[PDB]
Design a protein around this ligand. Structure first.
Ligand SMILES: [Mg+2]
Ligand SMILES: [Mg+2]
Ligand SMILES: [Mg+2]
Ligand SMILES: [Mg+2]
Ligand SMILES: [Mg+2]
Ligand SMILES: [Mg+2]
Ligand SMILES: [Mg+2]
Ligand SMILES: [Mg+2]
Ligand SMILES: [Mg+2]
Ligand SMILES: [Mg+2]
Ligand SMILES: [Mg+2]
Ligand SMILES: [Mg+2]
Ligand SMILES: [Mg+2]
Ligand SMILES: [Mg+2]
Ligand SMILES: [Mg+2]
Ligand SMILES: [Mg+2]
Ligand SMILES: [Mg+2]
Ligand SMILES: [Mg+2]
Lengths: 159, 235, 130, 52, 15, 185, 52
RNA sequence: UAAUCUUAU
RNA sequence: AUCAGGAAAAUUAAUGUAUACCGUAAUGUAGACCGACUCAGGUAUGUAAGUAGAGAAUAUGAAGGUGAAUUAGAUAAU
RNA sequence: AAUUUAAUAUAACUAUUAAUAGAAGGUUACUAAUAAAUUAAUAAUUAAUUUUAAAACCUAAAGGUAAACCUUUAUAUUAAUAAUGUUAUGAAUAAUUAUUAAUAAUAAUAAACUAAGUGAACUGAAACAUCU
């Protein structure tokens, strides 16, 4: 239910001008856990509306459809969320593929080295972020981790 | 009703056939609808299809809030602030000064302070029938530039009088939507960034979540060939 | 009388409107023999036993995993005073799936460390890079 | 439709009055339906017959 | 259209 | 003569499959063993697909009386089961032949010779079976002529080392996979 | 030691005591379920301790 | 009778 | 007794078992199925109160179910 | 400013001529969404070209079946690690979760036109049998 009401009146409902569904771009910069929570809130809202909508259609035989419109809007936001979740995974996969191509990865490492590392006019913080980003090294063991260690050692030697 | 139809999509082909009636038998379809509807409900204007519907604010020549002179009607040469458009009909509902009809109405739909069943109600009217005002009426308006509106929160066009483009007819500033609902997230939380593309090693959303996100047994996603597969194929 | 308002013989049925109709219409769970089993896509869960029983296979049973820390402040709708945001990916043919863009974002993260974007900082903003 | 048994009880909130809620008020749609039935199924001299 | 108008009128009466 | 009922036959032109292209919906399980026979496989006297009929299909024509009362008859070829010796295969191959075909074989001096004649006419009047036989014979002849050297052990030597190297990185490696990897190398 | 139904009952009690699931959770993890459910009004045949 | 053909393992 | 009577799918020990899906209304010697009809036709099985009897014949009828889309009168000839 | 006449629509088929090219249905639901880029030409744009997401079940040919259902188990192994608890003597044996690598899969496909195989009879001959 919503505020323990058998049915939300027109005044109890959120008006159409005040309410908007989520934008895909807005969703794109939200964390996974947050997105998951949002999805479940949406689902809960739909359930509340679905109960109410059913009552309206089955018993009173209305064609007012505000609840239905709300449910549709929520459904739109949900699929947008689903899309951004898929899209993020795909983007990650593409990045992985790009990194797997060796020359491109080497070029990227060189670019990283030139601008921000080994320069003056923070570094440790960058390294710790870079470590997490590119290799499996937080503060467990693998070929990638080893490679990252070697790279770090090389950077230290340079500096 | 006692229906249950609304929790499913049953008899789909039949519904499609009914929904997408041929346009040359549209008078046949609507004749009986007209008969069915009471006088206070029914409208004279044609219910246009969603294809031919003014969705953009360029397609509508006028927005709810702007001041317009009425013509080609009973209440012609009358200024009226347009109250709200009807989406299905492609028409505007004007204020008290616009065109109306006096029709009997049941006590379910009675306004507070009514003696008789008879009530005057505003008829819908097309954008063709009414012209803008600024006092000076505008013959026709054209759109040439565009800009972000502060109040509307959209990249709206510039309403310019036809011929001389510098004479801008400005948009009507809408009413302030004072939002106080439990189902609308506030501006600060709605936009706060909690994700960043950081890791190449760890994937952002877990492996057990993927099946919900996309169909792993998708018939559409064809596999790529290999050398061995080619060799097997070719004699 | 079957119904007292109809005293005389109109061509009305004992029940319903028409006896006849399209017989060729898909079966449901209710129809057919005792042996006719349609099913409703509900239970490819466990395995049927040799004797006629059933044994659930829990690794093939649907759980509905909910986040442990529910962000309740996220709502199904956004406040309409917030404009709908718009991303722009100029200089990236792949768009949001572009690997070059992703690499750039990673580089930015490394340099700065979780800095919020134009849209995230300013609610009045409507267009953005990321 | 799945019934469940639960360890704590529950009773629904009481349905609203016709005057209170806008939507939960079956008089209007039922009246409309009746009017439609009358008008489509009106044949000859029942056009003159006054409406219910 | 009429229904929407009626709703608007009700809202106006309320406020 | 002509080979009308053979050379009229048409088969669906398979598109040339590049290594990087997308798959077809129905790819077969077991690979193609034999080469594609230009003229497919006969779709009329399917009796003749199993043997060396020498392009001799069944005729249909008219039984005609003294009254010239026409009645439909068919004219079958003089087919015969015959186990004939292949020098190349070093075994006798038993098949259905037309008596004519047997005569041709005898004239040419062997069954392998009959199969391997380079003329197009022969190719046409070989069956799908006949084409397969030809392929078997020709391949065998080629093998006889040219043994591989005139590598496997090296692969076998390297395999365990390669597996160990893979394990050291982290992954396991099975032979079949190793073979697949180092076929073109 | 004990029969099957009794074991099941014991398990259920243990789960209740925990505030964990009173039932064996499956492995097929659905993160983003799209299913909705309509809470119905109670019939005469049901109690206050039921919901359909 | 290593022409043909039938049966069984 | 001659008429000579289906087919096919193991046991101890240890470790398990949170128990899936579908059927369930009413009608079914019928107005709810097959007969163009709320059609004296056709339609499978089991209980089928007692008293009587050789009996599931026959009479009655405890209980249950039912008394009907035609009524009221008159009852010539037929 | 309005009316009329003729022509033109996303919104008829048929015949001819000219030009161009060789193309999804149903079922009911946990409804089967999309995102972008570059280029002219007047930031939004329309247009062109290119990329990209999702897309249930059935439609002979994963295996069944009484189409829209059932069963296979790719939210699988197999291995390698890491974290957890138990057994027996720091090493060994099984189970659960989480990464990494390896292993297969989805026929709804036109109809007319063409070529090949087999090939009637009514009918005509004022009969009928060669012939048609
Ligand atoms: Mg019929
Ligand atoms: Mg039945
Ligand atoms: Mg059972
Ligand atoms: Mg029953
Ligand atoms: Mg019962
Ligand atoms: Mg009964
Ligand atoms: Mg009867
Ligand atoms: Mg019937
Ligand atoms: Mg009859
Ligand atoms: Mg008795
Ligand atoms: Mg009685
Ligand atoms: Mg009865
Ligand atoms: Mg009667
Ligand atoms: Mg199929
Ligand atoms: Mg079966
Ligand atoms: Mg032909
Ligand atoms: Mg004749
Ligand atoms: Mg005759």
């Amino acid at each position: 239910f919503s505020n323990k009401k058998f049915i939300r009146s027109a005044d109890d409902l959120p008006p159409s001008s005040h309410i908007r569904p989520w934008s895909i771009p807005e969703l794109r910069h939200k964390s996974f856990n947050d997105l998951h929570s949002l999805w479940y809130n949406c689902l809960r809202e739909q359930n509340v509306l679905a109960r109410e909508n059913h009552l309206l259609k089955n018993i009173v035989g209305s064609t007012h459809d505000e609840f239905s419109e709300l449910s549709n809007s929520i459904r739109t936001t949900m699929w947008q969320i689903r899309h951004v979740l898929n899209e993020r995974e795909l983007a990650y996969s593409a990045s992985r593929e790009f990194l797997q191509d060796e020359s491109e990865r080497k070029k990227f490492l060189d670019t990283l080295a030139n601008d921000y590392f080994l320069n003056k006019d923070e570094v440790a913080s960058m390294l710790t972020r870079f470590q997490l980003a590119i290799f499996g090294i937080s503060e467990t063991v693998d070929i990638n981790f080893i490679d990252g260690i070697k790279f770090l050692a090389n950077l230290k030697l340079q500096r | 009703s006692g229906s249950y139809q609304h929790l499913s999509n049953v008899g789909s082909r039949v519904m499609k056939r009914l929904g997408n009636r041929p346009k040359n038998f549209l008078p046949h379809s609507e004749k009986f609808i007209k008969k069915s509807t009471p006088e206070f409900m029914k409208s004279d204007l044609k219910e246009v299809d969603e294809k031919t519907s003014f969705k953009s604010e360029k397609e509508w020549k006028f927005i709810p809030g702007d001041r317009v002179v009425v013509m080609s009607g009973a209440s012609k040469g009358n200024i009226a602030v347009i109250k709200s458009f009807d989406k299905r009909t492609n028409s505007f509902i004007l204020d008290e000064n616009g065109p109306t009809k006096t029709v009997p109405v049941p006590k379910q739909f009675w306004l507070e302070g009514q003696t008789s069943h008879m009530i005057t109600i505003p008829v819908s009217i097309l954008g063709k029938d009414l012209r803008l005002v600024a006092t000076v009426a505008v013959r026709d308006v054209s759109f040439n530039g565009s800009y972000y509106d502060a109040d509307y929160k959209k990249v709206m066009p510039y309403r310019c009088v036809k011929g001389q483009p510098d004479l801008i007819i400005p948009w009507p500033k809408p009413d302030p939507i004072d939002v106080q609902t439990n189902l609308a997230t506030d501006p600060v939380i709605a936009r706060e960034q909690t994700f960043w593309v950081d890791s190449v090693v760890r994937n952002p959303i877990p492996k057990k979540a993927i099946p919900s996100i996309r169909n792993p047994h998708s018939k559409y996603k064809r596999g790529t060939l290999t050398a061995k597969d080619i060799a097997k194929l070719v004699a | 009388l079957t119904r007292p308002w109809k005293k005389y013989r109109d061509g009305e049925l004992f029940y319903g409107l028409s006896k006849v109709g399209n017989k060729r219409v898909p079966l449901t769970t209710k129809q057919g023999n005792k042996t006719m089993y349609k099913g409703t896509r509900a239970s490819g869960i466990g395995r049927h036993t040799k004797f006629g029983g059933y044994v659930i296979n829990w690794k093939k049973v649907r759980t509905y995993v909910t986040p442990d820390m529910v962000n309740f402040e996220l709502k199904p709708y956004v406040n309409a005073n917030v404009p709908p945001l718009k991303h722009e990916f100029k200089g990236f043919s792949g768009g949001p799936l572009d690997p070059r863009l992703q690499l750039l974002k990673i580089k930015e993260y490394i340099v700065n460390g979780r800095v919020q974007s134009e849209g995230a900082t300013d609610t009045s903003c409507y267009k953005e890079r990321g | 439709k799945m019934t469940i048994e639960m360890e704590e009880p529950f009773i629904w909130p009481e349905e609203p009055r016709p005057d209170e809620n806008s939507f939960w008020d079956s008089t209007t749609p039922d009246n409309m339906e009746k009017y439609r039935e009358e008008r489509l199924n009106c044949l000859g001299s029942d056009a003159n017959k006054p409406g219910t | 259209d009429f229904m929407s108008w009626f709703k608007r009128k009700k809202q106006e009466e309320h406020q | 003569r002509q080979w009308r009922l053979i050379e009229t036959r048409k088969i669906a032109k398979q598109p040339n499959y590049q290594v990087g292209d997308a798959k077809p919906l129905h790819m077969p399980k077991e690979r193609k063993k034999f080469p594609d026979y230009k003229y497919g496989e006969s779709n009329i006297f399917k009796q003749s697909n199993k043997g060396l009929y020498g392009g001799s299909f069944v005729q249909f024509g008219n039984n005609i009386s003294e009254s010239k009362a026409k009645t439909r008859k068919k004219w079958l070829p003089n087919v015969v089961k015959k186990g004939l010796w292949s020098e190349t295969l070093n075994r006798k191959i038993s098949i259905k032949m037309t008596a004519k075909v047997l005569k041709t074989i005898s004239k040419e001096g062997g069954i392998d010779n009959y199969l391997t004649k380079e003329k197009s006419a022969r190719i046409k009047e070989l069956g799908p079976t006949g084409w397969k036989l030809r392929y078997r014979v020709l391949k065998r002849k080629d093998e006889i002529e040219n043994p591989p050297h005139k590598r496997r052990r090296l692969m076998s030597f390297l395999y365990p080392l390669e597996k160990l190297e893979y394990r050291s990185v982290g992954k396991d490696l099975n032979y079949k996979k190793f073979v697949e990897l180092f076929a073109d190398v | 030691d004990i029969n099957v139904s009794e074991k099941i009952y014991k398990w259920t009690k243990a789960g209740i005591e925990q505030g964990k699931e009173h039932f064996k959770v499956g492995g097929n993890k659905v993160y983003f379920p799209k299913a909705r459910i309509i809470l119905l009004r109670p019939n005469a045949k049901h109690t206050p301790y039921q919901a359909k």
